Design a protein around this ligand. Structure first.
Ligand SMILES: Nc1ncnc2c1ncn2[C@@H]1O[C@H](CSCC[C@H](N)C(=O)O)[C@@H](O)[C@H]1O
Length: 236
């Protein structure tokens, strides 16, 4: 959909939590009518706006008349190819219907070291939930933080639920590239509670004890990595 945040007053509040600096190159997902894009070119070194809506690219361009450090590409973020030998960060007020696809695309198919996104409130909560697959796959590559709540009244058309500003920070991957397959399988089996397909009854117990997991309905990412580790040990 297209839910713009156009109040200068609200834009400043949100920018308050976004610590991007003058030397960062930025890729914005969905510049829309250019409201955040205008603040990013003033705050950052350079900004590449990726907008699917051909018209909005023009509108974005008109709003950025007095600025030079940017460009607006009329592409689909889902098919975009990010730099591989460059330092850059990402910002984006994104559509809910493809948030998953967008986050997977920018976390697994880009090397942005820091990502700022405005997403649906509930969506943001699921991202921190170790009971869901997406959360576990993402936590192996980035640290996730919910920075603030963005009231639905800040948007127009006004969505049904509130949104959240989240921050994703790249870190040294906790899963080696050679364990991608085995980690993928493990994650899926664990979130579906198909314990018997990855742990014998005794292996299961020892692993939880070893990981220090008292509540099987409340585990930290660290406790999960412990499990994935024991899983490997039991099948090397
Ligand atoms: N797959 C995709 N690739 C690039 N842009 C997309 C996209 N799907 C939606 N968009 C664009 O992302 C925006 C979502 S709303 C964000 C509007 C803007 N940041 C503002 O508040 O002014 C729209 O401009 C929409 O056209």
């Amino acid at each position: 959909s297209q839910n713009f945040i156009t109040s200068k007053h609200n834009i400043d509040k949100i920018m308050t939590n976004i610590r991007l600096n003058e030397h960062d190159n930025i890729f914005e997902i969905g510049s829309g009518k250019g409201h955040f894009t205008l603040e990013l070119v003033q705050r950052c070194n350079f900004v590449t706006a990726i907008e699917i809506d051909h018209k909005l690219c023009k509108t974005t361009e008109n709003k950025l008349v007095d600025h030079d450090n940017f460009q607006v590409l009329n592409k689909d973020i889902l098919q975009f190819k990010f730099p591989k030998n460059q330092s850059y960060k990402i910002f984006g007020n994104i559509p809910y219907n493809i948030s998953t696809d967008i986050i997977r695309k920018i976390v697994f198919d880009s090397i942005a070291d820091e990502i700022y996104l405005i997403v649906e409130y509930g969506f943001a909560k699921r991202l921190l939930n170790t009971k869901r697959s997406l959360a576990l796959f993402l936590m192996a590559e980035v640290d996730i933080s919910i920075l603030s709540m963005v009231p639905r009244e800040y948007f127009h058309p006004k969505p049904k639920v509130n949104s959240s500003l989240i921050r994703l920070n790249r870190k040294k991957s906790r899963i080696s590239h050679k364990d991608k397959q085995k980690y993928n399988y493990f994650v899926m089996k664990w979130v579906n509670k198909e314990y018997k397909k990855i742990f014998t009854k005794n292996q299961f117990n020892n692993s939880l004890k070893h990981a220090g997991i008292d509540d099987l309905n409340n585990i930290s990412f660290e406790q999960f990595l412990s499990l994935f580790n024991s899983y490997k040990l039991f099948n090397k």
